[PDB]
Amino acid sequence: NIVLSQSPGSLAVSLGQRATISCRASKSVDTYGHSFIHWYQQKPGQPPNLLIHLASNLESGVPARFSGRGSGTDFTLTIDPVEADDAATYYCQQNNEDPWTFGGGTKLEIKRADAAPTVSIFPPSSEQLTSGGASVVCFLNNFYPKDINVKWKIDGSERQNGVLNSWTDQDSKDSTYSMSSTLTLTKDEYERHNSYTCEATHKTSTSPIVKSFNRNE
């Protein structure tokens, strides 16, 4: 197998600036001076899509901001100037030899201005409570960068067990992330306490953003 190694794994680039990503093949991919290796963009929730054919031929209808260079074992894809829509994972793929193979991908993160999360807390729904379960959900929406910490407090004491966290992919339009945190308790434990708190710490502030409710208030 020809192996393709892409670097870096992740790159963050500001809007308007140049991004350059590399693909290295374990063996030459050239025959007849042509490089049998191609570049694809994969936006979240979509299949990949071919941008650059035979290392350097820009696909019809792909913006001229995209360009490919290289020969033998060393290839680069350059996006200049980077736009919000470019937030995606890029893959090289060779077919000079079988099997056709893909590189491991490079995720391009658009480096927008730092933004603090919009935080919302949600008590268990009555329908869940009927079935003896109790999930408290906190949404931390539209922030940047992706690093963020959530602390759950019950009556002022921290709770670590039973929390499930999920992050969205970077938004195509506004270049932010969002994150959902769910603390799941039994109904009986939920009903033994009054105040529920989610605290978000993000680099945008020295103090956490705190959202709270008091049960049956």
Binding site: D30, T31, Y32, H34, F36, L54, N95, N96, D98
Partner: peptide
Amino acid sequence: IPEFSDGFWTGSQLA
């Protein structure tokens, strides 16, 4: 360059 098709499915095969 010819497109890949029956009997031609890798770049090496162009030789």
